[PDB]
């Protein structure tokens, strides 16, 4: 699951239609994740990339998943006669559970995290921070 080696420029653009500090993540030729400078909430940014390349996007501070053009995998496609491809970054409709972890994880230091009263299976879920590497494997088995 890797970016194809080019070698054909592709003018892309990341609109951040989300309310988080977005983190572009590019998928190397080997398949490793490369972080690119972050995109604040309303903002956007013109990028050069390449037909065939793989990009995904996450909340830059907590790595929560985000959609681009309604999927997770953004493939800069052919530019031709038309100029930039659009990369609309959005919240998905998170499960209410996932949504709950999110606040919760962010109101308590996981340092301090043992000391809250709830089923322990719940406590593993909170510890289970979403992760590129993870989703990278997850998004691998399809």
């Amino acid at each position: 699951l890797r970016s194809v080696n080019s070698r054909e420029p592709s003018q892309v653009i990341f609109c951040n239609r989300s309310p988080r500090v977005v983190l572009p993540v590019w998928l190397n030729f080997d398949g490793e994740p490369q972080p690119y400078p972050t995109l604040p909430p309303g903002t956007g940014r013109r990028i050069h990339s390449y037909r065939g390349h793989l990009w995904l996007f996450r909340d830059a501070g907590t790595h929560d998943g985000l959609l681009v053009n309604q999927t997770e995998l953004f493939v800069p496609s052919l530019n031709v006669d038309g100029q930039p491809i659009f990369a609309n970054i959005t919240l998905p409709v998170y499960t209410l559970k996932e949504r709950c972890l999110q606040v919760v994880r962010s109101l308590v230091k996981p340092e301090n995290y043992r000391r809250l009263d709830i089923v322990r299976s719940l406590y593993e879920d909170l510890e289970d921070h979403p992760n590129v590497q993870k989703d990278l494997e997850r998004l691998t088995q399809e």
């Binding site: 959005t90 919240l91 409709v93 209410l96 949504r99 972890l101 109101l107 089923v119």
Partner: protein, 86 residues
């Protein structure tokens, strides 16, 4: 068309059946009414709103908003979201 969900504290949230079906736990609980001996009002109202939210925003370009959760409510909600699988 409609169902009723009754909180641990008495309150009745009457809601559309498909909206309620969102939660598998609930689905299984009918097939009418679900009493929820374990979920207070400040918690089931937020759930129902979440169903509305999910149902409207699922399958949609129109930029999606944050579902919001006040702090005080979060634990309780996380426990409910988890019992109900939603």
């Amino acid at each position: 068309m409609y169902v009723k969900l009754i909180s641990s504290d008495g309150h009745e949230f009457i809601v559309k059946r498909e909206h309620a079906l969102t939660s598998g736990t609930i689905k299984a609980m009918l097939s009418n009414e679900v009493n929820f001996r374990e979920i207070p009002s400040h918690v089931l109202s937020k759930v129902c709103m979440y169903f509305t939210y999910k149902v409207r925003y699922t399958n949609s370009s129109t930029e999606i908003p944050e579902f919001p959760i006040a702090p005080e409510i979060a634990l309780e909600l996380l426990m409910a979201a988890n019992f109900l699988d939603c």
